[PDB]
mmCIF file with all atom_site columns, C-alpha atoms and ligand atoms in Angstrom:
data_model
loop_
_atom_site.group_PDB
_atom_site.id
_atom_site.type_symbol
_atom_site.label_atom_id
_atom_site.label_alt_id
_atom_site.label_comp_id
_atom_site.label_asym_id
_atom_site.label_entity_id
_atom_site.label_seq_id
_atom_site.pdbx_PDB_ins_code
_atom_site.Cartn_x
_atom_site.Cartn_y
_atom_site.Cartn_z
_atom_site.occupancy
_atom_site.B_iso_or_equiv
_atom_site.pdbx_formal_charge
_atom_site.auth_seq_id
_atom_site.auth_comp_id
_atom_site.auth_asym_id
_atom_site.auth_atom_id
_atom_site.pdbx_PDB_model_num
ATOM   1   C CA  . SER A 1 1  ? -8.354  36.352  -24.836 1.00 32.10 ? 308  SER A CA  1
ATOM   2   C CA  . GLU A 1 2  ? -8.040  35.023  -21.263 1.00 33.46 ? 309  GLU A CA  1
ATOM   3   C CA  . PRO A 1 3  ? -11.224 35.732  -19.251 1.00 36.41 ? 310  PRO A CA  1
ATOM   4   C CA  . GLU A 1 4  ? -10.306 33.130  -16.594 1.00 32.21 ? 311  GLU A CA  1
ATOM   5   C CA  . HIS A 1 5  ? -6.980  34.802  -15.741 1.00 32.06 ? 312  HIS A CA  1
ATOM   6   C CA  . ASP A 1 6  ? -7.862  36.080  -12.271 1.00 32.40 ? 313  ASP A CA  1
ATOM   7   C CA  . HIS A 1 7  ? -9.593  32.940  -11.010 1.00 33.01 ? 314  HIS A CA  1
ATOM   8   C CA  . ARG A 1 8  ? -6.681  30.924  -12.337 1.00 34.37 ? 315  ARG A CA  1
ATOM   9   C CA  . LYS A 1 9  ? -4.198  33.012  -10.390 1.00 35.41 ? 316  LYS A CA  1
ATOM   10  C CA  . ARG A 1 10 ? -6.354  32.590  -7.289  1.00 38.66 ? 317  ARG A CA  1
ATOM   11  C CA  . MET A 1 11 ? -6.600  28.821  -7.509  1.00 37.89 ? 318  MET A CA  1
ATOM   12  C CA  . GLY A 1 12 ? -2.903  28.771  -8.269  1.00 36.92 ? 319  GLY A CA  1
ATOM   13  C CA  . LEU A 1 13 ? -2.231  30.598  -5.043  1.00 38.31 ? 320  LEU A CA  1
ATOM   14  C CA  . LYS A 1 14 ? -4.481  28.178  -3.161  1.00 33.78 ? 321  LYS A CA  1
ATOM   15  C CA  . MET A 1 15 ? -2.882  25.102  -4.694  1.00 36.35 ? 322  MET A CA  1
ATOM   16  C CA  . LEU A 1 16 ? 0.693   26.167  -3.901  1.00 35.39 ? 323  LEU A CA  1
ATOM   17  C CA  . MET A 1 17 ? -0.246  26.680  -0.290  1.00 35.85 ? 324  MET A CA  1
ATOM   18  C CA  . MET A 1 18 ? -2.125  23.428  -0.378  1.00 35.38 ? 325  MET A CA  1
ATOM   19  C CA  . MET A 1 19 ? 0.705   21.414  -1.905  1.00 32.79 ? 326  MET A CA  1
ATOM   20  C CA  . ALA A 1 20 ? 3.198   23.246  0.302   1.00 30.82 ? 327  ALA A CA  1
ATOM   21  C CA  . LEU A 1 21 ? 1.226   21.865  3.209   1.00 29.12 ? 328  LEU A CA  1
ATOM   22  C CA  . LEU A 1 22 ? 0.696   18.350  1.835   1.00 29.09 ? 329  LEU A CA  1
ATOM   23  C CA  . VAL A 1 23 ? 4.155   17.347  0.581   1.00 29.55 ? 330  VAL A CA  1
ATOM   24  C CA  . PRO A 1 24 ? 6.086   17.293  3.893   1.00 29.38 ? 331  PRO A CA  1
ATOM   25  C CA  . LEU A 1 25 ? 3.252   15.370  5.537   1.00 27.96 ? 332  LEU A CA  1
ATOM   26  C CA  . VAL A 1 26 ? 2.875   12.605  2.970   1.00 31.89 ? 333  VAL A CA  1
ATOM   27  C CA  . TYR A 1 27 ? 6.630   12.280  2.610   1.00 31.38 ? 334  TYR A CA  1
ATOM   28  C CA  . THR A 1 28 ? 6.882   12.012  6.386   1.00 29.02 ? 335  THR A CA  1
ATOM   29  C CA  . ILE A 1 29 ? 4.265   9.272   6.244   1.00 27.89 ? 336  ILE A CA  1
ATOM   30  C CA  . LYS A 1 30 ? 6.404   7.438   3.707   1.00 30.10 ? 337  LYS A CA  1
ATOM   31  C CA  . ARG A 1 31 ? 9.434   7.824   5.957   1.00 30.88 ? 338  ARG A CA  1
ATOM   32  C CA  . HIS A 1 32 ? 7.301   6.413   8.755   1.00 30.14 ? 339  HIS A CA  1
ATOM   33  C CA  . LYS A 1 33 ? 6.093   3.343   6.874   1.00 28.71 ? 340  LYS A CA  1
ATOM   34  C CA  . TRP A 1 34 ? 9.560   2.682   5.417   1.00 27.68 ? 341  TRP A CA  1
ATOM   35  C CA  . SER A 1 35 ? 11.563  3.350   8.580   1.00 29.43 ? 342  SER A CA  1
ATOM   36  C CA  . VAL A 1 36 ? 11.393  -0.291  9.661   1.00 28.51 ? 343  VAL A CA  1
ATOM   37  C CA  . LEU A 1 37 ? 13.172  -1.301  6.442   1.00 27.51 ? 344  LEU A CA  1
ATOM   38  C CA  . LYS A 1 38 ? 15.566  1.645   6.491   1.00 26.07 ? 345  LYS A CA  1
ATOM   39  C CA  . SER A 1 39 ? 16.704  0.798   10.012  1.00 26.00 ? 346  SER A CA  1
ATOM   40  C CA  . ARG A 1 40 ? 16.647  -3.000  9.985   1.00 24.03 ? 347  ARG A CA  1
ATOM   41  C CA  . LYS A 1 41 ? 19.822  -4.979  10.663  1.00 23.28 ? 348  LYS A CA  1
ATOM   42  C CA  . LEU A 1 42 ? 20.719  -8.422  9.378   1.00 25.33 ? 349  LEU A CA  1
ATOM   43  C CA  . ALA A 1 43 ? 23.538  -10.836 10.187  1.00 24.65 ? 350  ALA A CA  1
ATOM   44  C CA  . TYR A 1 44 ? 24.940  -14.154 9.014   1.00 25.54 ? 351  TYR A CA  1
ATOM   45  C CA  . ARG A 1 45 ? 25.459  -17.041 11.419  1.00 26.92 ? 352  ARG A CA  1
ATOM   46  C CA  . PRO A 1 46 ? 26.872  -20.271 9.972   1.00 26.84 ? 353  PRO A CA  1
ATOM   47  C CA  . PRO A 1 47 ? 26.539  -23.212 12.412  1.00 21.28 ? 354  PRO A CA  1
ATOM   48  C CA  . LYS A 1 48 ? 30.290  -23.851 12.583  1.00 21.88 ? 355  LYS A CA  1
ATOM   49  C CA  . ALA B 2 1  ? 4.750   -28.139 53.061  1.00 20.31 ? 1106 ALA B CA  1
ATOM   50  C CA  . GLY B 2 2  ? 3.330   -31.580 53.758  1.00 20.42 ? 1107 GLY B CA  1
ATOM   51  C CA  . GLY B 2 3  ? 4.261   -33.405 56.940  1.00 20.00 ? 1108 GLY B CA  1
ATOM   52  C CA  . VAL B 2 4  ? 6.339   -30.541 58.297  1.00 19.40 ? 1109 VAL B CA  1
ATOM   53  C CA  . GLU B 2 5  ? 5.322   -29.001 61.600  1.00 19.27 ? 1110 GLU B CA  1
ATOM   54  C CA  . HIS B 2 6  ? 6.070   -25.278 61.501  1.00 17.85 ? 1111 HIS B CA  1
ATOM   55  C CA  . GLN B 2 7  ? 7.772   -24.741 64.845  1.00 16.90 ? 1112 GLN B CA  1
ATOM   56  C CA  . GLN B 2 8  ? 10.089  -27.694 64.278  1.00 20.46 ? 1113 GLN B CA  1
ATOM   57  C CA  . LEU B 2 9  ? 11.089  -26.237 60.926  1.00 19.21 ? 1114 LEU B CA  1
ATOM   58  C CA  . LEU B 2 10 ? 11.664  -22.828 62.487  1.00 18.04 ? 1115 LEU B CA  1
ATOM   59  C CA  . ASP B 2 11 ? 13.596  -24.005 65.528  1.00 20.60 ? 1116 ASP B CA  1
ATOM   60  C CA  . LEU B 2 12 ? 15.676  -26.121 63.176  1.00 22.46 ? 1117 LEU B CA  1
ATOM   61  C CA  . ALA B 2 13 ? 16.119  -23.235 60.741  1.00 23.66 ? 1118 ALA B CA  1
ATOM   62  C CA  . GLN B 2 14 ? 17.577  -21.113 63.528  1.00 20.04 ? 1119 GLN B CA  1
ATOM   63  C CA  . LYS B 2 15 ? 20.466  -23.555 63.962  1.00 20.12 ? 1120 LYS B CA  1
ATOM   64  C CA  . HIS B 2 16 ? 21.631  -23.488 60.340  1.00 20.00 ? 1121 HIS B CA  1
ATOM   65  C CA  . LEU B 2 17 ? 20.255  -20.582 58.323  1.00 19.43 ? 1122 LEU B CA  1
ATOM   66  C CA  . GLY B 2 18 ? 21.071  -18.182 61.142  1.00 15.12 ? 1123 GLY B CA  1
ATOM   67  C CA  . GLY B 2 19 ? 24.664  -18.002 59.954  1.00 16.54 ? 1124 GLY B CA  1
ATOM   68  C CA  . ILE B 2 20 ? 23.596  -16.149 56.820  1.00 17.59 ? 1125 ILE B CA  1
ATOM   69  C CA  . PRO B 2 21 ? 24.700  -12.489 56.755  1.00 20.46 ? 1126 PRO B CA  1
ATOM   70  C CA  . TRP B 2 22 ? 21.814  -10.026 56.992  1.00 20.12 ? 1127 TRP B CA  1
ATOM   71  C CA  . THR B 2 23 ? 23.261  -6.525  57.050  1.00 17.86 ? 1128 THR B CA  1
ATOM   72  C CA  . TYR B 2 24 ? 24.498  -5.900  53.512  1.00 15.88 ? 1129 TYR B CA  1
ATOM   73  C CA  . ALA B 2 25 ? 28.208  -6.296  52.873  1.00 17.50 ? 1130 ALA B CA  1
ATOM   74  C CA  . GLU B 2 26 ? 29.598  -2.974  51.596  1.00 16.21 ? 1131 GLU B CA  1
ATOM   75  C CA  . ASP B 2 27 ? 25.977  -1.861  52.186  1.00 17.12 ? 1132 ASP B CA  1
ATOM   76  C CA  . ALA B 2 28 ? 25.250  -2.808  48.568  1.00 19.75 ? 1133 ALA B CA  1
ATOM   77  C CA  . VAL B 2 29 ? 21.718  -2.219  47.271  1.00 18.42 ? 1134 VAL B CA  1
ATOM   78  C CA  . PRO B 2 30 ? 20.310  -3.490  43.938  1.00 18.43 ? 1135 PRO B CA  1
ATOM   79  C CA  . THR B 2 31 ? 18.919  -0.791  41.632  1.00 17.00 ? 1136 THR B CA  1
ATOM   80  C CA  . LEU B 2 32 ? 15.831  -2.118  39.828  1.00 17.05 ? 1137 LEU B CA  1
ATOM   81  C CA  . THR B 2 33 ? 14.108  -0.077  37.106  1.00 15.80 ? 1138 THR B CA  1
ATOM   82  C CA  . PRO B 2 34 ? 10.662  -0.093  35.432  1.00 21.02 ? 1139 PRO B CA  1
ATOM   83  C CA  . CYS B 2 35 ? 12.359  -1.269  32.249  1.00 24.45 ? 1140 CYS B CA  1
ATOM   84  C CA  . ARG B 2 36 ? 11.275  -0.379  28.712  1.00 21.57 ? 1141 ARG B CA  1
ATOM   85  C CA  . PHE B 2 37 ? 9.457   -2.597  26.224  1.00 18.92 ? 1142 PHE B CA  1
ATOM   86  C CA  . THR B 2 38 ? 10.630  -2.327  22.606  1.00 17.76 ? 1143 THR B CA  1
ATOM   87  C CA  . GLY B 2 39 ? 8.350   -3.112  19.659  1.00 15.68 ? 1144 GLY B CA  1
ATOM   88  C CA  . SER B 2 40 ? 11.102  -4.776  17.628  1.00 15.90 ? 1145 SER B CA  1
ATOM   89  C CA  . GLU B 2 41 ? 11.269  -8.222  16.020  1.00 16.36 ? 1146 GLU B CA  1
ATOM   90  C CA  . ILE B 2 42 ? 13.860  -10.909 15.274  1.00 17.30 ? 1147 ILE B CA  1
ATOM   91  C CA  . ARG B 2 43 ? 13.560  -13.290 12.331  1.00 18.80 ? 1148 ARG B CA  1
ATOM   92  C CA  . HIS B 2 44 ? 16.013  -16.207 12.179  1.00 18.17 ? 1149 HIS B CA  1
ATOM   93  C CA  . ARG B 2 45 ? 15.666  -18.585 9.226   1.00 19.69 ? 1150 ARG B CA  1
ATOM   94  C CA  . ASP B 2 46 ? 17.209  -21.970 8.274   1.00 17.39 ? 1151 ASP B CA  1
ATOM   95  C CA  . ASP B 2 47 ? 14.690  -23.044 5.617   1.00 14.18 ? 1152 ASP B CA  1
ATOM   96  C CA  . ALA B 2 48 ? 15.568  -26.751 5.834   1.00 15.06 ? 1153 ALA B CA  1
ATOM   97  C CA  . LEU B 2 49 ? 13.703  -27.085 9.138   1.00 12.61 ? 1154 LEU B CA  1
HETATM 98  C C1  . CDL C 3 .  ? 9.466   17.578  4.325   1.00 13.23 ? 1520 CDL C C1  1
HETATM 99  C C2  . CDL C 3 .  ? 10.919  17.595  3.749   1.00 13.23 ? 1520 CDL C C2  1
HETATM 100 C C3  . CDL C 3 .  ? 10.934  17.659  2.209   1.00 13.23 ? 1520 CDL C C3  1
HETATM 101 C C4  . CDL C 3 .  ? 10.113  16.514  1.562   1.00 13.23 ? 1520 CDL C C4  1
HETATM 102 C C5  . CDL C 3 .  ? 10.618  16.173  0.138   1.00 13.23 ? 1520 CDL C C5  1
HETATM 103 C C6  . CDL C 3 .  ? 9.566   15.405  -0.699  1.00 13.23 ? 1520 CDL C C6  1
HETATM 104 C C7  . CDL C 3 .  ? 10.144  14.871  -1.975  1.00 13.23 ? 1520 CDL C C7  1
HETATM 105 C C8  . CDL C 3 .  ? 10.024  13.377  -2.085  1.00 13.23 ? 1520 CDL C C8  1
HETATM 106 C C9  . CDL C 3 .  ? 10.759  12.834  -3.307  1.00 13.23 ? 1520 CDL C C9  1
HETATM 107 O O1  . CDL C 3 .  ? 10.529  13.293  -4.405  1.00 13.23 ? 1520 CDL C O1  1
HETATM 108 O O2  . CDL C 3 .  ? 11.734  11.779  -3.161  1.00 13.23 ? 1520 CDL C O2  1
HETATM 109 C C10 . CDL C 3 .  ? 11.314  10.512  -3.719  1.00 13.23 ? 1520 CDL C C10 1
HETATM 110 C C11 . CDL C 3 .  ? 10.445  9.802   -2.682  1.00 13.23 ? 1520 CDL C C11 1
HETATM 111 C C12 . CDL C 3 .  ? 11.094  8.488   -2.300  1.00 13.23 ? 1520 CDL C C12 1
HETATM 112 O O3  . CDL C 3 .  ? 11.830  8.678   -1.058  1.00 13.23 ? 1520 CDL C O3  1
HETATM 113 P P1  . CDL C 3 .  ? 12.840  7.525   -0.618  1.00 13.23 ? 1520 CDL C P1  1
HETATM 114 O O4  . CDL C 3 .  ? 13.474  6.939   -1.845  1.00 13.23 ? 1520 CDL C O4  1
HETATM 115 O O5  . CDL C 3 .  ? 12.088  6.442   0.127   1.00 13.23 ? 1520 CDL C O5  1
HETATM 116 O O6  . CDL C 3 .  ? 13.969  8.124   0.329   1.00 13.23 ? 1520 CDL C O6  1
HETATM 117 C C13 . CDL C 3 .  ? 15.089  7.298   0.630   1.00 13.23 ? 1520 CDL C C13 1
HETATM 118 C C14 . CDL C 3 .  ? 15.120  7.013   2.149   1.00 13.23 ? 1520 CDL C C14 1
HETATM 119 O O7  . CDL C 3 .  ? 14.864  8.234   2.834   1.00 13.23 ? 1520 CDL C O7  1
HETATM 120 C C15 . CDL C 3 .  ? 16.488  6.507   2.611   1.00 13.23 ? 1520 CDL C C15 1
HETATM 121 O O8  . CDL C 3 .  ? 17.477  7.126   1.794   1.00 13.23 ? 1520 CDL C O8  1
HETATM 122 P P2  . CDL C 3 .  ? 18.255  8.432   2.368   1.00 13.23 ? 1520 CDL C P2  1
HETATM 123 O O9  . CDL C 3 .  ? 19.197  8.019   3.456   1.00 13.23 ? 1520 CDL C O9  1
HETATM 124 O O10 . CDL C 3 .  ? 19.021  9.091   1.253   1.00 13.23 ? 1520 CDL C O10 1
HETATM 125 O O11 . CDL C 3 .  ? 17.198  9.473   2.953   1.00 13.23 ? 1520 CDL C O11 1
HETATM 126 C C16 . CDL C 3 .  ? 17.622  10.821  3.135   1.00 13.23 ? 1520 CDL C C16 1
HETATM 127 C C17 . CDL C 3 .  ? 16.863  11.706  2.156   1.00 13.23 ? 1520 CDL C C17 1
HETATM 128 C C18 . CDL C 3 .  ? 15.815  10.862  1.421   1.00 13.23 ? 1520 CDL C C18 1
HETATM 129 O O12 . CDL C 3 .  ? 16.432  10.244  0.300   1.00 13.23 ? 1520 CDL C O12 1
HETATM 130 C C19 . CDL C 3 .  ? 15.811  10.590  -0.967  1.00 13.23 ? 1520 CDL C C19 1
HETATM 131 O O13 . CDL C 3 .  ? 15.371  9.724   -1.676  1.00 13.23 ? 1520 CDL C O13 1
HETATM 132 C C20 . CDL C 3 .  ? 15.721  12.082  -1.410  1.00 13.23 ? 1520 CDL C C20 1
HETATM 133 C C21 . CDL C 3 .  ? 14.298  12.657  -1.336  1.00 13.23 ? 1520 CDL C C21 1
HETATM 134 C C22 . CDL C 3 .  ? 14.082  13.566  -0.099  1.00 13.23 ? 1520 CDL C C22 1
HETATM 135 C C23 . CDL C 3 .  ? 15.207  14.584  0.086   1.00 13.23 ? 1520 CDL C C23 1
HETATM 136 C C24 . CDL C 3 .  ? 15.154  15.709  -0.981  1.00 13.23 ? 1520 CDL C C24 1
HETATM 137 C C25 . CDL C 3 .  ? 15.392  17.101  -0.378  1.00 13.23 ? 1520 CDL C C25 1
HETATM 138 C C26 . CDL C 3 .  ? 14.552  18.202  -1.091  1.00 13.23 ? 1520 CDL C C26 1
HETATM 139 C C27 . CDL C 3 .  ? 14.212  19.370  -0.159  1.00 13.23 ? 1520 CDL C C27 1
HETATM 140 O O14 . CDL C 3 .  ? 16.217  12.735  2.849   1.00 13.23 ? 1520 CDL C O14 1
HETATM 141 C C28 . CDL C 3 .  ? 17.091  13.547  3.635   1.00 13.23 ? 1520 CDL C C28 1
HETATM 142 O O15 . CDL C 3 .  ? 17.026  13.507  4.854   1.00 13.23 ? 1520 CDL C O15 1
HETATM 143 C C29 . CDL C 3 .  ? 18.109  14.475  2.949   1.00 13.23 ? 1520 CDL C C29 1
HETATM 144 C C30 . CDL C 3 .  ? 18.291  15.797  3.724   1.00 13.23 ? 1520 CDL C C30 1
HETATM 145 C C31 . CDL C 3 .  ? 18.670  16.971  2.810   1.00 13.23 ? 1520 CDL C C31 1
HETATM 146 C C32 . CDL C 3 .  ? 18.300  18.327  3.437   1.00 13.23 ? 1520 CDL C C32 1
HETATM 147 C C33 . CDL C 3 .  ? 18.527  19.511  2.469   1.00 13.23 ? 1520 CDL C C33 1
HETATM 148 C C34 . CDL C 3 .  ? 19.835  20.255  2.751   1.00 13.23 ? 1520 CDL C C34 1
HETATM 149 C C35 . CDL C 3 .  ? 19.607  21.717  3.167   1.00 13.23 ? 1520 CDL C C35 1
HETATM 150 C C36 . CDL C 3 .  ? 18.504  21.866  4.199   1.00 13.23 ? 1520 CDL C C36 1
HETATM 151 O O16 . CDL C 3 .  ? 9.124   9.577   -3.179  1.00 13.23 ? 1520 CDL C O16 1
HETATM 152 C C37 . CDL C 3 .  ? 9.011   9.168   -4.575  1.00 13.23 ? 1520 CDL C C37 1
HETATM 153 O O17 . CDL C 3 .  ? 9.389   8.055   -4.927  1.00 13.23 ? 1520 CDL C O17 1
HETATM 154 C C38 . CDL C 3 .  ? 8.391   10.132  -5.635  1.00 13.23 ? 1520 CDL C C38 1
HETATM 155 C C39 . CDL C 3 .  ? 9.306   10.283  -6.855  1.00 13.23 ? 1520 CDL C C39 1
HETATM 156 C C40 . CDL C 3 .  ? 8.546   10.247  -8.194  1.00 13.23 ? 1520 CDL C C40 1
HETATM 157 C C41 . CDL C 3 .  ? 7.681   11.515  -8.413  1.00 13.23 ? 1520 CDL C C41 1
HETATM 158 C C42 . CDL C 3 .  ? 7.097   11.583  -9.806  1.00 13.23 ? 1520 CDL C C42 1
HETATM 159 C C43 . CDL C 3 .  ? 7.655   12.787  -10.625 1.00 13.23 ? 1520 CDL C C43 1
HETATM 160 C C44 . CDL C 3 .  ? 6.540   13.633  -11.247 1.00 13.23 ? 1520 CDL C C44 1
HETATM 161 C C45 . CDL C 3 .  ? 6.638   13.700  -12.782 1.00 13.23 ? 1520 CDL C C45 1
HETATM 162 C C1  . PEE C 4 .  ? -16.024 12.498  -10.015 1.00 13.65 ? 1521 PEE C C1  1
HETATM 163 C C2  . PEE C 4 .  ? -14.832 11.768  -9.452  1.00 13.65 ? 1521 PEE C C2  1
HETATM 164 C C3  . PEE C 4 .  ? -13.527 12.518  -9.646  1.00 13.65 ? 1521 PEE C C3  1
HETATM 165 C C4  . PEE C 4 .  ? -12.518 12.248  -8.540  1.00 13.65 ? 1521 PEE C C4  1
HETATM 166 C C5  . PEE C 4 .  ? -11.296 13.180  -8.616  1.00 13.65 ? 1521 PEE C C5  1
HETATM 167 C C6  . PEE C 4 .  ? -10.364 13.058  -7.406  1.00 13.65 ? 1521 PEE C C6  1
HETATM 168 C C7  . PEE C 4 .  ? -9.012  13.793  -7.636  1.00 13.65 ? 1521 PEE C C7  1
HETATM 169 C C8  . PEE C 4 .  ? -8.204  14.060  -6.327  1.00 13.65 ? 1521 PEE C C8  1
HETATM 170 C C9  . PEE C 4 .  ? -6.836  14.765  -6.616  1.00 13.65 ? 1521 PEE C C9  1
HETATM 171 C C10 . PEE C 4 .  ? -6.471  15.873  -5.564  1.00 13.65 ? 1521 PEE C C10 1
HETATM 172 C C11 . PEE C 4 .  ? -5.147  16.621  -5.901  1.00 13.65 ? 1521 PEE C C11 1
HETATM 173 C C12 . PEE C 4 .  ? -5.291  18.141  -5.728  1.00 13.65 ? 1521 PEE C C12 1
HETATM 174 C C13 . PEE C 4 .  ? -4.135  18.773  -4.939  1.00 13.65 ? 1521 PEE C C13 1
HETATM 175 C C14 . PEE C 4 .  ? -4.415  20.259  -4.550  1.00 13.65 ? 1521 PEE C C14 1
HETATM 176 C C15 . PEE C 4 .  ? -5.653  20.837  -5.283  1.00 13.65 ? 1521 PEE C C15 1
HETATM 177 C C16 . PEE C 4 .  ? -6.310  22.029  -4.541  1.00 13.65 ? 1521 PEE C C16 1
HETATM 178 O O1  . PEE C 4 .  ? -5.970  22.325  -3.404  1.00 13.65 ? 1521 PEE C O1  1
HETATM 179 O O2  . PEE C 4 .  ? -7.347  22.791  -5.207  1.00 13.65 ? 1521 PEE C O2  1
HETATM 180 C C17 . PEE C 4 .  ? -8.107  23.675  -4.352  1.00 13.65 ? 1521 PEE C C17 1
HETATM 181 C C18 . PEE C 4 .  ? -8.519  24.910  -5.201  1.00 13.65 ? 1521 PEE C C18 1
HETATM 182 C C19 . PEE C 4 .  ? -9.572  25.798  -4.541  1.00 13.65 ? 1521 PEE C C19 1
HETATM 183 O O3  . PEE C 4 .  ? -9.919  26.822  -5.471  1.00 13.65 ? 1521 PEE C O3  1
HETATM 184 P P1  . PEE C 4 .  ? -11.242 27.665  -5.203  1.00 13.65 ? 1521 PEE C P1  1
HETATM 185 O O4  . PEE C 4 .  ? -12.314 27.262  -6.184  1.00 13.65 ? 1521 PEE C O4  1
HETATM 186 O O5  . PEE C 4 .  ? -10.930 29.130  -5.354  1.00 13.65 ? 1521 PEE C O5  1
HETATM 187 O O6  . PEE C 4 .  ? -11.737 27.360  -3.716  1.00 13.65 ? 1521 PEE C O6  1
HETATM 188 C C20 . PEE C 4 .  ? -13.122 27.102  -3.490  1.00 13.65 ? 1521 PEE C C20 1
HETATM 189 C C21 . PEE C 4 .  ? -13.286 26.454  -2.113  1.00 13.65 ? 1521 PEE C C21 1
HETATM 190 N N1  . PEE C 4 .  ? -12.299 25.433  -1.913  1.00 13.65 ? 1521 PEE C N1  1
HETATM 191 O O7  . PEE C 4 .  ? -9.074  24.452  -6.439  1.00 13.65 ? 1521 PEE C O7  1
HETATM 192 C C22 . PEE C 4 .  ? -8.307  24.843  -7.580  1.00 13.65 ? 1521 PEE C C22 1
HETATM 193 O O8  . PEE C 4 .  ? -8.282  26.010  -7.944  1.00 13.65 ? 1521 PEE C O8  1
HETATM 194 C C23 . PEE C 4 .  ? -7.524  23.759  -8.345  1.00 13.65 ? 1521 PEE C C23 1
HETATM 195 C C24 . PEE C 4 .  ? -8.466  22.857  -9.187  1.00 13.65 ? 1521 PEE C C24 1
HETATM 196 C C25 . PEE C 4 .  ? -7.692  21.751  -9.919  1.00 13.65 ? 1521 PEE C C25 1
HETATM 197 C C26 . PEE C 4 .  ? -7.910  20.367  -9.237  1.00 13.65 ? 1521 PEE C C26 1
HETATM 198 C C27 . PEE C 4 .  ? -7.632  19.187  -10.199 1.00 13.65 ? 1521 PEE C C27 1
HETATM 199 C C28 . PEE C 4 .  ? -7.665  17.827  -9.463  1.00 13.65 ? 1521 PEE C C28 1
HETATM 200 C C29 . PEE C 4 .  ? -8.030  16.670  -10.415 1.00 13.65 ? 1521 PEE C C29 1
HETATM 201 C C30 . PEE C 4 .  ? -7.233  15.389  -10.095 1.00 13.65 ? 1521 PEE C C30 1
HETATM 202 C C31 . PEE C 4 .  ? -8.075  14.101  -10.316 1.00 13.65 ? 1521 PEE C C31 1
#
């Protein structure tokens, strides 16, 4: 009923490792691109 | 520079600038550093300009 069972488990193992590798990296890239907005200050300076 | 003769300027300088202290008071020495360069930015506005 499920001939592809083994290969599916194999790819599944590969994908978890793969995603386990990719997520921290891409999220870190997002933190990197967004850090300038996350850290930016702003102030208000009326002339008087 | 210009019409100045050097030795006149020097002999004259000895009579006035010679009163300047040379040995450091309190032996003070300035402490310069190879200071950092940030990559930041500032963005002031006033749109009416
Ligand atoms: C590598 C480390 C783990 C990476 C986690 C990746 C998950 C990314 C994610 O899903 O968050 C949304 C992330 C957005 O991040 P962000 O909103 O810019 O973060 C806010 C800033 O960091 C600024 O807000 P912030 O100050 O709250 O940022 C802090 C927070 C980031 O703030 C967040 O938004 C939370 C997301 C990351 C923290 C989740 C921790 C999970 C582990 O991250 C932390 O540093 C929290 C530390 C907690 C440590 C855990 C405690 C025990 C150890 O990307 C997305 O928008 C995807 C969401 C939609 C997915 C579609 C769903 C499928 C169906
Ligand atoms: C034609 C144009 C189509 C363009 C499609 C581009 C889609 C890019 C999406 C990428 C997201 C995938 C994240 C992780 C997937 C992954 O690591 O799969 C690897 C893994 C390797 O398995 P093996 O065959 O045993 O290895 C042989 C040698 N490598 O493959 C799998 O088993 C998972 C296959 C499902 C992939 C589906 C992606 C489709 C998204 C579009």
